[PDB]
Amino acid sequence: KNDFSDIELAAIPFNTLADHYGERLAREQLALEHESYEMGEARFRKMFLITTLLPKMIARINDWFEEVKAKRGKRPTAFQFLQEIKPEAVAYITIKTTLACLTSADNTTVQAVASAIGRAIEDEARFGRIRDLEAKHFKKNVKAFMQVVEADMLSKGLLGGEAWSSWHKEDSIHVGVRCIEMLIESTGMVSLHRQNAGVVGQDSETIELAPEYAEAIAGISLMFQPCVVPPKPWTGITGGGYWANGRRPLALVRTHSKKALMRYEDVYMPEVYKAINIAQNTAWKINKKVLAVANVITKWKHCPVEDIPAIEREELPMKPEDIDMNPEALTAWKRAAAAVYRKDKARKSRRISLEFMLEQANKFANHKAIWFPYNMDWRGRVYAVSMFNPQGNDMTKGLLTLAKGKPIGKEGYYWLKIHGANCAGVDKVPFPERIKFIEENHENIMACAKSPLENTWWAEQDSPFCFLAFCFEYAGVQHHGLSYNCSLPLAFDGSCSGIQHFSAMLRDEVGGRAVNLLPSETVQDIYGIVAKKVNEILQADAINGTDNEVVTVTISEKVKLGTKALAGQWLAYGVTRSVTKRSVMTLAYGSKEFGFRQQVLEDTIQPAIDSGKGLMFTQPNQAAGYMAKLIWESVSVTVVAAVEAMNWLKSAAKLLAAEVKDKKTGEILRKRCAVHWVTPDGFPVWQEYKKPIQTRLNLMFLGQFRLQPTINTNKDSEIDAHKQESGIAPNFVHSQDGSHLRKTVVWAHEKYGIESFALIHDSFGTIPADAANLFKAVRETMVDTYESCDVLADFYDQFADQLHESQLDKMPALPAKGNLNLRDILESDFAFA
DNA sequence: GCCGTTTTTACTCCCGTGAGTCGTATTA
DNA sequence: TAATACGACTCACAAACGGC
RNA sequence: GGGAGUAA
C-alpha cells in the first residue's frame, strides 16, 4: 500500500478528537480547518480545456528528466528538487498555482509565480501529499469535549514543526521557473512578455495568460479559523494551536526567517509557554443577541452607526459642458474631482473592511463553545491566530461573549454597570458617577434591549455593539435577579500602556499620576493635560507672534503663515484631547517632531476638511507642522523622566548596532550586535537586523534567452549596524510589554479561580463574578515585577557589559526613582489597567 | 568633508533586465 | 577527461544620521 | 513600494 510517515499524523488528531467528543464534531473540526484550501481547491475546479493540459505537461516533465540524465556535468538546480514528488502531481501543482496567481491578480511578475509554485511543490515533502490523504477523512460520510488534550499524551506526529519556507529562496525560484519553462512548451498555457524594457525602476518580466484561456475562464480566506476544541498546548517552538497534520504547523514566534525561529529551539522559557497556553485555552462563544442585531442593521442603507459609511457611492460632479479652454475648464474641476476619488476611497476602504468583518462573524456565528488559537509576535505580545477575533473592532467584539459563566450578582453587577459606562462615552470619571450614569438611563436601557431595531440610542454611543451587548445583559439581571448567570467579558484597559510602564520601570510620578497609576478621586487625563499646555501656548501666539511671509520659491510664489495666523485657525477649531491623543502616545515609542506633523494631518486636519469643518486650515501642512511644534514642546515637560529613559535606551542600541573603527587600520575589534533583553516572566526578546542583500539567478529560459531575476536573498550576510542601533531601544520596551500581559494572565489565573480571559494587549476582560479579582490581579502582577526585577536595572544587566569602552562615557544612566507608592494602584478607581 | 536619504514593529487586507564571459561543481 | 548547468561578476538599455 | 483596518 502507501507507506512513509504521515498515516499516523493524520489519524491521531481525528482519533483523540473522536474519543472525547465523538466522531461527530471531530469530523466537522478537521473539515473547518482543512477548509483553507479545501475551498481553495473547490475554487480551482471552478475555474477548471484542462483535460488536455495535464497529460501534455506530464509527458514533458518525464522527457525533460531523460534529457537531463543523459547529459553530463552539473544538473539544473530545479531537477533534484522536482524529483521529490511523482511527475503527475508536479504538473498538477504547476497548473493550479499558475492559475491561482493570474486569476485573482492583474499582473503578474515571473518571480512571484515561480516563488508560489516552488513553495507549493515543496510540501510536497512535506504537507501537500498529506493533504490528499488527510482530505479523505472529512469527505467519507460525507461532552466532556471542552477539555484540553494532555500535552504528554500527544503523539510525536503532532509535535514537529518547520513553519518556514525551507530550501534556498533561490532553490524555490529555480523550481518555479523550470515548471513555467516546461509549462510553455507544452503548451504553453501562459506567455512570457517583457515590460518597460529600459527603465531602471519599471523594467520587469511578467507572466501573461494566453488570450484563448482568458476567454475560456469560469479572499477571504479559510486558512485560519477558530477552534471547536481546546487548542494543542505549545510544547516546543512549532506545532501548537491547531491539530491537523495535513497543514503546515504554526510557529510560536513569527520571524522573518527560519534561522531566527531556530534561535528558540533550546531556550527553556516555562513562564512564556505557560502564559500563551492559558490565554489560548480561553473558551469563547458567539454573542447571539448582538449577532441578531448586527445581521439586520448593517443591511440598512442608512445605518445609525456613524463610522458606518455608504452605501451611497456618490458620483463624480460634474463637467459643466466646458471644453474649453482654459484655466477655468481644467483646474477645477480636476481638483474637485480629485477630492471625490479620495472621499470615496476612504469610504471604500472602510466599507470593504466592514463587509469582511460581517462575513467572518456570519461564518463562526452559531455553535456551542468556540475557541481561538494564540500566537505571539517576535516580542511578547499575544495574538489570536484566526481572522475573526475577540481582539477585533466594536462589532466583532460585540458579536462575541464567553461560554462558561459564574453566578454572579452583587459584586459582579457593580462592575457590569462600570463596563456599560465604559462602552459609552463615559470612561474618564469616578466610578460612583459611572454607576450614576447607568442608573439615570434605566429607561434608555431596557428599552434598547426590548426593541434594538426600534430604539437606536445604543448606536449613538462610543462603542455601539459592545454597549448593546451590555443592554441585553443588563435587562437579564433586572428580570431574573442577582442569580442571573452572566458571561459578558468586562474589559479593563491601561490608561496609556507605555507611559505607564516607563513610569513603573523608572519610578516616575509624575509621570503617572498622569497615566492613572496612583489612586485618585479624579481621572487623570494625560491627553487633556498636554492639550491644556498647548492651549496655553496657543493663546500666547494669538496676540503676540509672527506675521505672514512670502517665501517666493520658483509664480511661483506662496504665502507662509506666521504663528499668529495658525494660532487663530486652531482656536477657531478647538484643540482638545483628541488632537494630542495619538501624539502623546507615539512619543513614548521613540517618535520625532516631523512624525507628529503626519499624525495631526491624518487624524485632525484632513478629516476636518473632508467633513466640511476644516475651512480654517488654508495651509493644511503648515498648520500641521505648527501644531506638531506645540506638542513637542508641551509634552516634553510632561514625560521628562520618560525622555531620558528613552534616550538611555536609544544610546544603548545605537552603540550596539555600530561597527567598530580603528586608526587607518580596518581592524574588526567588534561587529554589529543585536539588542537583547529578558522580560520579567522569562520571555527573551532579540532586536537584531541583517543587511538586506539582493542576488540574481542565471536561467537559460526555453533555450532562447537568459532569465535573470533580481531576488531578495534569504541567505544571511553582514550584521546591519544602523538598524541594530535604531532598533535596540524599541525592541526593549516591546519585549517587556509583551511579557507583562503574559505574566498578568498566568498570575491572575493560577491565583484566583479565573478560567476565561479576554485579552487585547493591554485590555483585560473576564466574567462579572471574576471581574473583582482581575481588577486586583492586574495591579498585583505589575507591582510584583517592579520592583522584583527592575526592568531598567534588569535591562541594564543584559548589556552591562556588552558596551565596549569609551562608550560608557556617552551612556547615562540612570533615571532616578520618584515617590510613588505602588500599593496606591490597588486603591485607584480610574486606572482600569 | 560633502552629499543624499530618512523619520516607533508587525500583521492583515486590498489592489531591475538578458548577454558576454569565466570558473566550477557535478556526472555519464 | 568531456559534457552539462549555473552562480558569480560586469556591462548596457527642516534637521539629523549614514554612506560615499 | 503604496493604500486601508486592528493592537502596543
Confirm whether any atom of chain D, the nucleic acid strand, is less than 7 Å from CB of A254: no
DSSP state of A46: S
Cell matching residue A410: 452583587
Query: Which of these, A536, A511, A498, A530, lies nearest to A600 by C-alpha position?
Result: A530
A193 contact partners, CB below 8 Å, separation of at least 6: A206, A207, A208
Confirm whether any atom of chain D, the nucleic acid strand, is less than 7 Å from CB of A387: no
Report H helices in A637-716: 640-656
Provide the sign of the torsion angle of the four alpha carbons A624, A630, A633, A638, taken in this order. Answer: negative
Annotated active-site residue in A377, A427, A493, A784: A493
Would residue A832 count as lying in a domain?
no
Confirm whether any atom of chain D, the nucleic acid strand, is less than 7 Å from CB of A450: no
The C-alpha angle with vertex A377 and arms to A376 and A379, in degrees rounded to 5, equals 100
Quick check: A139 and A14 in contact, CB under 8 A? Answer: no
SS3 content of chain A, % helix, strand, coil (to 5): 45, 10, 45
| Resolution reading in Å | 6.7
Do A344 and A399 belong to one domain?
Answer: no
Do A717 and A743 belong to one domain?
Answer: no
Task: Output the CA–CA distances (angstroms, integers) from residue A161 to A230, A326, A395, in the order listed.
Answer: 19, 66, 35
Would residue A827 count as lying in a domain?
no
Q: How many CB atoms lie within 10 A of CB A354?
A: 18
A630 contact partners, CB below 8 Å, separation of at least 6: A534, A537, A538
Method used to obtain the model:
X-ray
- Length A293 CA → C1 C1' (Å): 81
Confirm whether any atom of chain B, the nucleic acid strand, is less than 7 Å from CB of A544: no
Cell matching residue A808: 560608557
Query: Which of these, A538, A646, A628, lies nearest to A583 by C-alpha position?
Result: A628
Query: Which of these, A475, A448, A478, lies nearest to A460 by C-alpha position?
Result: A448
Query: Which of these, A2, A4, A6, A5, lies nearest to A246 by C-alpha position?
Result: A6
Quick check: A659 and A690 in contact, CB under 8 A? Answer: no
Quick check: A57 and A94 in contact, CB under 8 A? Answer: yes
Q: How many structural domains are present in chain A? A: 5
Name residue A678's amino acid.
Answer: V
Alpha carbons A747 and A464: distance in angstroms, whole number: 32
Do A657 and A531 belong to one domain?
Answer: yes
Cell matching residue A816: 532616578
A560 contact partners, CB below 8 Å, separation of at least 6: A548, A549, A550, A551, A619, A622
Q: Residue for cell digits 490608561?
A: A495
Name residue A817's amino acid.
Answer: K
Would residue A771 count as lying in a domain?
yes
Alpha carbons A512 and A502: distance in angstroms, whole number: 9
Alpha carbons A737 and A505: distance in angstroms, whole number: 11
Q: Which element (helix H / strand E) includes A678?
A: strand A675-678
Q: Which element (helix H / strand E) includes A758?
A: strand A758-759
Name residue A95's amino acid.
Answer: I
Alpha carbons A675 and A649: distance in angstroms, whole number: 10
Three-state SS letters, A205-245: EEEEECHHHHCCCCCCCCCCCCECCCCECCCCCECCECCCC
Do A435 and A535 belong to one domain?
Answer: no
Would residue A372 count as lying in a domain?
no
Q: At what angle do helices A791-798 and A721-751 cross, to 10 degrees?
A: 140
Provide the domain limits for residue A350: 282-367
Alpha carbons A694 and A322: distance in angstroms, whole number: 52
Three-state SS letters, A330-359: CCCCHHHHHHHHHHHHHHHHHHHHHHHHHH
Between the two ends of chain A, the Cα-to-Cα distance in Å is 60
Cell matching residue A583: 501624539
Q: What is residue A85's three-state secondary structure?
A: coil
Alpha carbons A516 and A833: distance in angstroms, whole number: 9
DSSP class per residue in A2-41:
--STTHHHHHHHHHHHHHHS-TTHHHHHHHHHSTTTHHHH
Provide the sign of the torsion angle of the four alpha carbons A588, A589, A594, A599, taken in this order. Answer: negative
Do A326 and A266 belong to one domain?
Answer: no
Would residue A721 count as lying in a domain?
yes
Task: Output the CA–CA distances (angstroms, integers) from residue A503 to A123, A498, A782, in the order listed.
Answer: 49, 8, 12
Q: In the listed set A734, A754, A771, which residue is the last one of a domain according to the structure?
A: A734
Quick check: A747 and A784 in contact, CB under 8 A? Answer: yes
Do A61 and A176 belong to one domain?
Answer: yes
Do A263 and A310 belong to one domain?
Answer: no
Q: At what angle do helices A577-587 and A620-636 cross, to 10 degrees?
A: 60
Task: Output the CA–CA distances (angstroms, integers) from residue A445 to A21, A426, A527, A622, A674, in the order listed.
Answer: 40, 15, 30, 46, 55
Do A201 and A57 belong to one domain?
Answer: yes
The CB-side HSE value for A449 (13 A sphere, CA atoms) comes to 18
Would residue A610 count as lying in a domain?
yes
Quick check: A712 and A187 in contact, CB under 8 A? Answer: no
Alpha carbons A431 and A262: distance in angstroms, whole number: 48
Quick check: A257 and A371 in contact, CB under 8 A? Answer: no
Q: What is residue A295's three-state secondary structure?
A: helix
Alpha carbons A565 and A445: distance in angstroms, whole number: 47
Confirm whether any atom of chain C, the nucleic acid strand, is less than 7 Å from CB of A660: no
Do A472 and A499 belong to one domain?
Answer: no
DSSP state of A203: -
Task: Output the CA–CA distances (angstroms, integers) from residue A614 to A310, A335, A619, A628, A833, in the order listed.
Answer: 22, 17, 11, 17, 36
Alpha carbons A393 and A384: distance in angstroms, whole number: 14
Quick check: A642 and A508 in contact, CB under 8 A? Answer: yes
Would residue A830 count as lying in a domain?
no
Provide the sign of the torsion angle of the four alpha carbons A244, A249, A253, A255, taken in this order. Answer: negative
Quick check: A770 and A754 in contact, CB under 8 A? Answer: yes
Alpha carbons A687 and A460: distance in angstroms, whole number: 44
Provide the sign of the torsion angle of the four alpha carbons A290, A295, A296, A301, taken in this order. Answer: positive
A717: domain CATH number is 1.10.150.20
Task: Output the CA–CA distances (angstroms, integers) from residue A447 to A372, A471, A482, in the order listed.
Answer: 33, 9, 20
A107 contact partners, CB below 8 Å, separation of at least 6: A206, A207
Annotated active-site residue in A737, A762, A770, A794: A762
Alpha carbons A116 and A93: distance in angstroms, whole number: 10
Name residue A414's amino acid.
Answer: Y
Cα A414 off chain centre by = 33
Task: Output the CA–CA distances (angstroms, integers) from residue A17 to A424, A513, A814, in the order listed.
Answer: 42, 51, 55
Query: Which of these, A786, A779, A766, lies nearest to A831 by C-alpha position?
Result: A779
- Length A698 CA → B21 C1' (Å): 13
- Length A254 CA → B7 C1' (Å): 26
A445: domain CATH number is 1.10.287.280
A114: domain CATH number is 1.10.1320.10
The C-alpha angle with vertex A520 and arms to A515 and A521, in degrees rounded to 5, equals 125
My answer on whether omega of the bond before A449 falls inside 30° of 0, hence cis, is no
Residue-wise over A151-168: b if at least 16 C-beta within 10 A, else e? eeebeebbbebbbbbebe
A295: domain CATH number is 1.10.287.260
Q: What is residue A107's three-state secondary structure?
A: coil
Confirm whether any atom of chain D, the nucleic acid strand, is less than 7 Å from CB of A762: yes
Do A450 and A328 belong to one domain?
Answer: no
Cell matching residue A806: 569609551
A451 contact partners, CB below 8 Å, separation of at least 6: none
Annotation says A716 is catalytic: no
Alpha carbons A250 and A635: distance in angstroms, whole number: 42
The CB-side HSE value for A255 (13 A sphere, CA atoms) comes to 24
Alpha carbons A272 and A681: distance in angstroms, whole number: 7
Parallel/antiparallel/unpaired status of strands A374-377 and A253-254: parallel
Q: How many CB atoms lie within 10 A of CB A712?
A: 10
Confirm whether any atom of chain C, the nucleic acid strand, is less than 7 Å from CB of A362: no
> Assign residue A325 a region: left if phi > 0, alpha if psi is -120 to 50, beta otherwise?
left
Query: Which of these, A728, A717, A732, A719, lies nearest to A660 by C-alpha position?
Result: A719
Task: Output the CA–CA distances (angstroms, integers) from residue A268 to A53, A199, A374, in the order listed.
Answer: 52, 52, 19
Cell matching residue A46: 471552478
Task: Output the CA–CA distances (angstroms, integers) from residue A319 to A2, A295, A316, A328, A333, in the order listed.
Answer: 70, 40, 9, 11, 7
Would residue A6 count as lying in a domain?
yes
Parallel/antiparallel/unpaired status of strands A763-765 and A758-759: antiparallel
Do A561 and A444 belong to one domain?
Answer: no
Strand partners, A109: A206
Q: In the listed set A230, A253, A281, which residue is the last one of a domain according to the structure?
A: A281
Do A679 and A690 belong to one domain?
Answer: yes
Query: Which of these, A289, A294, A299, lies nearest to A471 by C-alpha position?
Result: A289
Cell matching residue A189: 498555457
Q: What is residue A384's three-state secondary structure?
A: strand
Cell matching residue A138: 472529512
- Length A69 CA → B25 C1' (Å): 16
- The residue ranges of DSSP E strands in A489-575, in sequence order, are 492-493, 549-550, 559-560
Which strand D bases fall within 7 angstroms of a protein CB? 3-8
Residue-wise over A741-760: b if at least 16 C-beta within 10 A, else e? bbbbbbbbbeeeebbbbbbb
Q: In the listed set A341, A367, A393, which residue is the last one of a domain according to the structure?
A: A367
